[PDB]
Amino acid sequence: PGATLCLGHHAVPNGTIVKTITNDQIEVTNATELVQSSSTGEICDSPHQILDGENCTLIDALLGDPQCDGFQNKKWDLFVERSKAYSNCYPYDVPDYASLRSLVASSGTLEFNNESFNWTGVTQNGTSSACIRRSNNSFFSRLNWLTHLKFKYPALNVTMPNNEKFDKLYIWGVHHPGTDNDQIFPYAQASGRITVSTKRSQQTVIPNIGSRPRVRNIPSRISIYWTIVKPGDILLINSTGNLIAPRGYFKIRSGKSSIMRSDAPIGKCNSECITPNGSIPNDKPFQNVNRITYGACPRYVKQNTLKLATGMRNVPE
Amino acid sequence: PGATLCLGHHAVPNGTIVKTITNDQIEVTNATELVQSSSTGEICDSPHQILDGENCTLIDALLGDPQCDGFQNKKWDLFVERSKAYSNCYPYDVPDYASLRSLVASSGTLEFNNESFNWTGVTQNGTSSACIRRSNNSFFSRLNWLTHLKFKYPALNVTMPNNEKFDKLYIWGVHHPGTDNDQIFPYAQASGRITVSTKRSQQTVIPNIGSRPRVRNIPSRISIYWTIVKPGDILLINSTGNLIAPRGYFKIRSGKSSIMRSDAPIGKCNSECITPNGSIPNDKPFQNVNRITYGACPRYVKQNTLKLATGMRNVPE
Amino acid sequence: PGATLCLGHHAVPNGTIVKTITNDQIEVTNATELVQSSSTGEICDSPHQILDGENCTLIDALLGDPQCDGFQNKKWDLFVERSKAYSNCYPYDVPDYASLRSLVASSGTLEFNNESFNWTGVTQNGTSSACIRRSNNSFFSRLNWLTHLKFKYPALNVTMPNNEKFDKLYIWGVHHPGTDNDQIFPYAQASGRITVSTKRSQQTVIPNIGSRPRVRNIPSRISIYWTIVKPGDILLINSTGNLIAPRGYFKIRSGKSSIMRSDAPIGKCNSECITPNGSIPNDKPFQNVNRITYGACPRYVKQNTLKLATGMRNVPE
Amino acid sequence: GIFGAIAGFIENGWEGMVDGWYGFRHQNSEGIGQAADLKSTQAAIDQINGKLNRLIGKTNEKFHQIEKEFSEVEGRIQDLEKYVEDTKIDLWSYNAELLVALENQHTIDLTDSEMNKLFEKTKKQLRENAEDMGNGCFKIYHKCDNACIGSIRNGTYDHDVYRDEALNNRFQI
Amino acid sequence: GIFGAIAGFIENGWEGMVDGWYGFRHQNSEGIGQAADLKSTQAAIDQINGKLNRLIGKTNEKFHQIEKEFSEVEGRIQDLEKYVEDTKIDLWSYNAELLVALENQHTIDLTDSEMNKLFEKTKKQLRENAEDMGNGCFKIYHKCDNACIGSIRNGTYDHDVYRDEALNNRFQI
Amino acid sequence: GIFGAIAGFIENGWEGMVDGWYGFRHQNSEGIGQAADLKSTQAAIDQINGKLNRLIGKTNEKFHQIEKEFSEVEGRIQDLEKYVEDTKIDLWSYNAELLVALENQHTIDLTDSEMNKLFEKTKKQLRENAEDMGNGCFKIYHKCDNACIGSIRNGTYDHDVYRDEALNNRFQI
Ligand SMILES: *[C@@H]1O[C@H](CO)[C@@H](O[C@@H]2O[C@H](CO)[C@@H](O[C@@H]3O[C@H](CO)[C@@H](O)[C@H](O[C@H]4O[C@H](CO)[C@@H](O)[C@H](O)[C@@H]4O)[C@@H]3O)[C@H](O)[C@H]2NC(C)=O)[C@H](O)[C@H]1NC(C)=O
Ligand SMILES: *[C@@H]1O[C@H](CO)[C@@H](O[C@@H]2O[C@H](CO)[C@@H](O[C@@H]3O[C@H](CO)[C@@H](O)[C@H](O[C@H]4O[C@H](CO)[C@@H](O)[C@H](O)[C@@H]4O)[C@@H]3O)[C@H](O)[C@H]2NC(C)=O)[C@H](O)[C@H]1NC(C)=O
Ligand SMILES: *[C@@H]1O[C@H](CO)[C@@H](O[C@@H]2O[C@H](CO)[C@@H](O[C@@H]3O[C@H](CO)[C@@H](O)[C@H](O[C@H]4O[C@H](CO)[C@@H](O)[C@H](O)[C@@H]4O)[C@@H]3O)[C@H](O)[C@H]2NC(C)=O)[C@H](O)[C@H]1NC(C)=O
Ligand SMILES: *[C@@H]1O[C@H](CO)[C@@H](O[C@@H]2O[C@H](CO)[C@@H](O[C@@H]3O[C@H](CO)[C@@H](O)[C@H](O[C@H]4O[C@H](CO)[C@@H](O)[C@H](O)[C@@H]4O)[C@@H]3O)[C@H](O)[C@H]2NC(C)=O)[C@H](O)[C@H]1NC(C)=O
Ligand SMILES: *[C@@H]1O[C@H](CO)[C@@H](O[C@@H]2O[C@H](CO)[C@@H](O[C@@H]3O[C@H](CO)[C@@H](O)[C@H](O[C@H]4O[C@H](CO)[C@@H](O)[C@H](O)[C@@H]4O)[C@@H]3O)[C@H](O)[C@H]2NC(C)=O)[C@H](O)[C@H]1NC(C)=O
Ligand SMILES: *[C@@H]1O[C@H](CO)[C@@H](O[C@@H]2O[C@H](CO)[C@@H](O[C@@H]3O[C@H](CO)[C@@H](O)[C@H](O[C@H]4O[C@H](CO)[C@@H](O)[C@H](O)[C@@H]4O)[C@@H]3O)[C@H](O)[C@H]2NC(C)=O)[C@H](O)[C@H]1NC(C)=O
Ligand SMILES: *[C@@H]1O[C@H](CO)[C@@H](O[C@@H]2O[C@H](CO)[C@@H](O)[C@H](O)[C@H]2NC(C)=O)[C@H](O)[C@H]1NC(C)=O
Ligand SMILES: *[C@@H]1O[C@H](CO)[C@@H](O[C@@H]2O[C@H](CO)[C@@H](O)[C@H](O)[C@H]2NC(C)=O)[C@H](O)[C@H]1NC(C)=O
Ligand SMILES: *[C@@H]1O[C@H](CO)[C@@H](O[C@@H]2O[C@H](CO)[C@@H](O)[C@H](O)[C@H]2NC(C)=O)[C@H](O)[C@H]1NC(C)=O
Ligand SMILES: *[C@@H]1O[C@H](CO)[C@@H](O)[C@H](O)[C@H]1NC(C)=O
Ligand SMILES: *[C@@H]1O[C@H](CO)[C@@H](O)[C@H](O)[C@H]1NC(C)=O
Ligand SMILES: *[C@@H]1O[C@H](CO)[C@@H](O)[C@H](O)[C@H]1NC(C)=O
Ligand SMILES: *[C@@H]1O[C@H](CO)[C@@H](O)[C@H](O)[C@H]1NC(C)=O
Ligand SMILES: *[C@@H]1O[C@H](CO)[C@@H](O)[C@H](O)[C@H]1NC(C)=O
Ligand SMILES: *[C@@H]1O[C@H](CO)[C@@H](O)[C@H](O)[C@H]1NC(C)=O
Ligand SMILES: *[C@@H]1O[C@H](CO)[C@@H](O)[C@H](O)[C@H]1NC(C)=O
Ligand SMILES: *[C@@H]1O[C@H](CO)[C@@H](O)[C@H](O)[C@H]1NC(C)=O
Ligand SMILES: *[C@@H]1O[C@H](CO)[C@@H](O)[C@H](O)[C@H]1NC(C)=O
Ligand SMILES: *[C@@H]1O[C@H](CO)[C@@H](O)[C@H](O)[C@H]1NC(C)=O
Ligand SMILES: *[C@@H]1O[C@H](CO)[C@@H](O)[C@H](O)[C@H]1NC(C)=O
Ligand SMILES: *[C@@H]1O[C@H](CO)[C@@H](O)[C@H](O)[C@H]1NC(C)=O
């Protein structure tokens, strides 16, 4: 008579297909997805400090466009710029715009200390019809538009030493007037010139009279430049006209901060990983949502799915 | 009496050596080469659209050197520049030559639409002994050399709006005359100046009188610049002398196109992968022919051979 | 009666823990460290040719600051710059300092051939109180400060052809005088201008009068530029003032050379791999000492230890 | 598959075993039954969880990086930025593909291994009292009630108790 | 090599087997013969073709890239361009070296595995009618003509038919 | 662990074996002894040295590279330089982690394999003269003095010499 004893293993009615070294399709009892491929669509406001730029670029908030007055002295882990943003102050450009944007984004603060520059011999606080603050003609909050006093503009030669323990970041500019009339009216002489220097650096800028296509009815332009000044070093501004001057400096830090272009809304929720499509969970090691990420994120890969087997081969009955 | 039954496996008289994790030399019955290490030496004319530059660089065909007149409005997947190429028109340079070359290469077309610029007050179509087209004195086909009319050169202020649905690419220049005689003769005044602007951009260029070492007997130079103009935006040229002006614009596309330096001849044959040494087959996953490739190519590695075993270990009799 | 025969394996009293695919902690009989994590602290003087910069940057030795006179015509595999270094000659800057430093470092020689430039009509060998050589007023050894002869400075137009089989590297400059007094005293006229050209290139530089913050009591500056001249090509210097001229050229080679910032001392010892913390052994495949390395070095990884098992699993008695 | 048990000499899995990954089926005087082996089940599961611990929830923080989308044509420097990111992405994509493919081969092999070890362990336990039928089953040459079967599953089977009965049945004519 | 059959207890391969990778040699009353086993041969071959399908003809298209050769010295930006490409090339070169070395170890092991499974399958089939000589051969303790040998190769051998003959021959004095 | 010998059916290692990695312990009429097996020991050691040859002393020369530390804020180009180096370092760090983890799994498995092959080889050698106790030990059913044990270790044991003695002892009542 006797007995029979059989060794065996389980199987399931609903197997899944995985790839192996020797076979692109083998069925296993169970598997798990290694690529994150979806977001809810919202950028979670925690645990990172999000600053929604809304109608403002980082640069506009930096320069102090009036609609960005709400941004004075703010900090961020991540600054979010919106595609609907637009400028509504004096037309400008920034040679190496991308680099200034990057270094501010990365510093992660708009903290601004005012400084009293000795601007004797000129009229301060120039304004315009293109930069409206509280219905009045105004200007960039962080910039100081200098014009003649009593139809005269002497050689400016102004110093500011950095005796602090941090770098100072100075933002300044040059007015390119639209016609010959707008070079003689505010500065009282045919040709401006600006020279911003330190012990280690010098930047010289020649203003350039001529019409540009009008932007918000204005055919002139401002060109923005920057200068970083170290401890023990000194800022020096020689100018003979056309100086758009600083009112002080920005603190430049180092840290974890950055900037991201996205139109995702901000949600009240907690998520370590932000993409431009929204926050994504970070349990999986890979993701195909976006190559642009911030925080503790899965790595971007081209694949849409990668199944890891978590069970034996499925051999149905 | 009984019987004997032996289990066994094949072997071959001509084994090959492969590497493993535990042994740098083990003999297997068969193997396959994973690194492609040869070309036939010819760039196959299919399936990619090849444009042989012959005596012309991409930039020369762009600017319209007369020996490149055959290239007007051509397209390419891959533009091939030859080491024997040379310029035979007015000596020039391009600040950021590499970038203009790259963006044109990548656009993959020389399609040019002419435009009627209002150049009243100056003489158009300047020519020279250094740019011979059909035995006559000529110039760059896409450029318009502007000089005085009746020994006078007024302030040019010319506009061209982009009301099209694509970007326009404008190429233009500045003549640097070789002596004081060649600044007063064609422009009628001591100092030129050029300013090309848009709503988002401005480029200003000061001509610079002085001798350069002669190139094809000419000691003057042209400096080439470019401006991209978006839909809704407008081009503006202020000039007081020395403007080498556009006759129109180039269509700038995005796509799969590029450029490659090679002296390989073009063959009537079909191959997906092009290197500068010639086309190579793309069955293998790796290749050590060239780090420069175009198309569906094996990846470049430093090794000359990598044998994958395709049979068991060989244990001879 | 009979016998018993047991098969078995060794074990050790002192096992070590390694990581595997399936277990982060399994004990094996023996293991070896794959990450090099220490240096002795000294840069070994063999087998690579080390040049200790001591008080001098590569650029100072290039330009010929008097405290760097010991460096004339030296070669190196690796140039070591010290944090204590400092300049003690005429204050200067280099637009694209990083690139000049890099191309010299990489050339790996300061070999300098003098050349006789025809500088008739001006006074050569200008000197200053800020550049002391052997208690006397001096200048940069490789530069030639040109001033007026008999209160006159004619248009210089000087040529030097490269008929050699190697590239020539020319270093030159522009004096930016500190006031109007120091533009008229040495050059005898209101505005200098420099134009260095070749058949393939032109660089033009406008001097710029104005005070900078004083560096070692001097408020003026020199700006350094470079020009490479190929075989068959020719150097041309037009100048109307302010030219800090070359005395000749540097040989520019290609090879294995580079530069490294370190304060490690130089030892009499032999080591293929140099980091800024000192030389490290290169038996291991990985290292976490420094991302900056020179020579035959283990690859930098973030981990501090990686144990490879070199024995079986340890299963104690 | 490399050991030959799962999808080899064991013809198929058992959908009716839901309390374990590996186990035993028997027929004796008292009927036909099934029981899961927990030790071999847990051995496989621990190994798979080990791989999961190395992959799930182990991400790395990045902050300010480079730009990866562009509104203007710029040439050289933009080419380099795009090239760096495209290079990076192909290398990680390669790492991910290889990882999954290697881990999956190993998971399939380790699970077949657990099946094989259980079978071998059981074969040794039975000594001369049983023969291997070649399909994962042992013919046991003695009366083996539910407590006896239980004793084989619990590692307490004393083969000397039944040896005489079994040798007599095995080497019959 | 990890299973111990190829270049282990099987002393060498057979150059005279050209119709398969694995097979059987026999000596009986009717002479000495050879026959390939197709199933184990195809099992090995399918697995190797699986690796080939993942490596051969699977390339990725690239178009405009960066410059990789230079006629002028430029410094900073050229250094970065060269560094990026050199970085990329070392990483792929590493991937290729590792891939081949791992795949080759696995191919050698999977082929030894196929040999081992065939041997084991045959051993179980023979039951008590044969003993393992230790070198891949079975001594069969009964008259086993060409049809009987054929039946072992085709999986149709009925061990009960010969058992009495075999036990008598095996446990002789 | 994948073969089931080390940390499986062999309960533990032997700290008293210092002249080899694998070996034999015995009890017979003449006492209780130990001897290392050199061939299986050397087989494991050769394989591990093979991995070491591929990792130790195989470094690649690099010379002028890019800058990796910076004293000034510069933006775009510095971002790209830092990003390239950070990318590179994560990829190598990944390669190193994977390498060690895979090699370690394989070393553990190859060493268990060597143990298993020795056990199997010995089992076949003994033929019908011994039975497997299930814990790495064979019960040998005949008088087996030190020269006989020696002969099993040296591959010279003639099983026919003792077969009659052993079958009589094995199939007793
Ligand atoms: C198919 O394979 C996958 C992977 O092996 C497997 O999914 C895993 O299952 C376990 C258990 O179901 C999950 O573990 C949970 O994780 C979450 C956190 O994300 C916890 O909330 C859970 O905690 C429970 O238990 C705790 C007590 O021990 C309590 O604190 C708590 O109240 C919960 O009850 C639990 O730890 C694991 O997350 C998944 N993993 C993945 C990647 O999905 C699945 O079960 C397998 N399917 C089958 C049919 O076997
Ligand atoms: C160089 O050429 C450019 C391009 O032609 C030129 O810029 C243009 O200047 C004109 C004239 O100043 C601008 O025209 C104005 O545009 C605004 C906004 O669109 C209109 O509201 C204005 O309307 C008033 O003027 C009309 C004309 O008499 C009246 O009929 C009307 O009732 C209004 O009072 C007016 O049309 C034009 O906007 C710019 N264009 C651009 C693209 O900038 C520039 O002036 C030239 N440079 C020089 C130095 O001459
Ligand atoms: C050593 O190992 C290698 C790799 O396993 C092996 O080489 C391979 O052999 C096969 C068959 O000989 C090749 O397959 C051919 O591929 C080409 C396309 O490149 C086809 O033209 C062939 O088609 C034939 O068969 C078809 C019918 O099924 C017909 O349509 C046609 O008319 C042809 O007759 C065929 O598919 C394969 O390309 C190679 N691979 C490599 C990488 O070389 C080689 O055979 C092994 N050597 C030994 C001695 O076993
Ligand atoms: C600044 O210095 C440079 C370099 O010296 C200088 O450029 C040179 O100018 C001379 C004179 O104009 C050029 O000489 C000509 O070259 C051509 C081509 O090689 C020759 O065919 C010419 O020959 C004619 O003139 C001869 C002299 O009278 C006659 O004897 C002969 O029969 C011909 O009629 C002539 O030699 C020379 O080519 C350039 N060199 C370079 C490298 O460019 C430049 O002129 C100076 N600048 C100023 C503003 O003075
Ligand atoms: C634990 O594992 C490690 C790795 O397997 C192991 O360390 C290795 O041991 C050997 C021998 O002890 C070392 O080999 C030496 O290498 C150095 C060069 O660096 C040589 O000087 C040595 O040469 C000796 O022998 C030669 C004759 O054959 C003579 O020429 C000479 O005079 C020397 O006596 C020798 O080749 C090897 O370097 C290490 N490797 C590492 C990475 O440490 C260790 O032994 C293992 N531990 C145990 C307890 O088993
Ligand atoms: C633009 O503004 C800047 C900043 O104010 C200015 O630069 C400064 O110029 C002054 C005056 O020339 C410099 O003062 C000298 O500094 C040195 C070194 O520290 C001192 O040794 C000097 O001392 C002498 O002069 C004193 C004043 O009469 C005497 O009392 C004394 O006994 C000495 O004889 C003197 O103080 C100053 O160093 C610079 N500062 C900087 C930061 O460069 C510049 O001159 C202005 N530009 C123009 C064109 O006016
Ligand atoms: C996340 O956003 C990205 C970027 O917009 C999406 O990728 C684009 O998808 C569109 C299709 O709608 C394509 O035409 C573009 O080529 C993609 N753009 C880029 C820049 O790659 C992506 O679809 C979104 N992903 C998820 C999961 O929502
Ligand atoms: C393909 O062309 C490349 C580039 O010319 C060749 O690589 C050069 O080979 C020469 C030897 O003739 C070396 O001196 C150079 O160092 C290499 N140049 C570069 C830029 O790497 C290569 O030999 C050719 N390959 C084949 C398969 O024909
Ligand atoms: C080698 O030198 C590097 C660079 O100085 C050291 O890394 C720094 O370590 C300090 C701690 O003292 C940290 O604050 C810095 O973040 C590190 N700097 C950088 C640039 O990474 C490292 O400690 C040294 N390594 C050894 C083994 O001596
Ligand atoms: C199989 O079915 C169950 C019950 O609906 C489900 O929860 C489980 O996830 C399925 N498993 C797989 C691997 O699809
Ligand atoms: C942004 O600008 C839009 C359009 O001009 C306006 O409707 C909206 O109120 C503004 N939003 C904020 C938050 O300032
Ligand atoms: C410039 O503006 C600020 C803020 O509106 C004001 O307090 C300051 O007094 C103004 N400056 C002068 C010189 O009036
Ligand atoms: C061995 O010989 C044959 C016949 O010449 C040949 O076709 C085959 O490719 C060779 N195999 C190897 C692996 O070299
Ligand atoms: C290219 O130039 C060479 C040398 O001047 C000439 O011989 C050849 O005919 C030209 N080829 C073409 C295709 O124009
Ligand atoms: C300039 O050249 C073109 C083509 O040769 C010609 O048709 C055009 O009329 C010329 N322009 C003028 C103003 O004559
Ligand atoms: C164990 O002990 C010995 C003797 O002190 C030592 O040399 C050896 O390296 C140790 N092994 C490990 C793996 O720690
Ligand atoms: C370097 O400069 C320091 C401080 O001025 C001085 O003490 C030292 O002697 C100098 N060393 C050399 C090698 O010139
Ligand atoms: C310039 O200096 C050098 C070296 O001190 C000297 O030999 C040369 O004659 C000087 N030049 C002139 C024109 O005096
Ligand atoms: C075997 O184990 C089960 C529980 O795991 C227990 O209920 C049963 O009584 C045991 N039987 C024997 C014979 O050991
Ligand atoms: C075994 O198979 C072969 C063909 O594969 C057949 O010719 C032979 O007759 C078969 N013999 C038996 C006994 O099954
Ligand atoms: C077995 O080998 C050992 C040495 O390895 C030898 O001393 C011994 O005499 C041998 N014995 C037999 C019986 O072969």
Numbering used by the authors:
A (entry chain A), B (entry chain A), C (entry chain A): 9 to 325
D (entry chain B), E (entry chain B), F (entry chain B): 1 to 173
Show passages lifted from the paper.
To understand the structural implications of this mutation, we determined crystal structures of Bris07 HA with both Leu (L194) and Pro (P194) at residue 194 to 1.70 Å and 2.30 Å, respectively. Except for a slight displacement (less than 1.0 Å) of the 190-helix and the 130-loop, the backbone conformations of Bris07 P194 and L194 are almost identical. Thus, the effect of the L194P substitution on antigenicity is not simply due to alteration of the overall structural conformation or of the amino-acid side-chain substitution per se. While the overall average B-value of Cα atoms in Bris07 P194 (58 Å2) was slightly lower than that of Bris07 L194 (64 Å2), the 190-helix (residues 188 to 197) in Bris07 P194 was notably higher (142 Å2) than that of Bris07 L194 (109 Å2). This difference could be visualized by comparing the electron density in the 2Fo-Fc maps, which was much weaker for the 190 helix of Bris07 P194 compared to that of Bris07 L194. The mobility of the 190-helix in Bris07 P194 was also captured in a molecular dynamics simulation. The major peak reaffirms that L194P increases the conformational dynamics of the 190-helix, whereas the minor peaks suggest that the increase in conformational dynamics propagates to some extent to the neighboring regions. The region with higher conformational dynamics in Bris07 P194 includes part of the RBS and antigenic site B. The Kd of C05 IgG for Bris07 L194 was around 3 nM, but for Bris07 P194 was much weaker at >5 μM, as measured by a biolayer interferometry binding assay. The elevated mobility as assessed by conformational dynamics in the 190-helix of Bris07 P194 apo form appears to be diminished in the receptor-bound forms, as suggested by normalized B-value analysis.
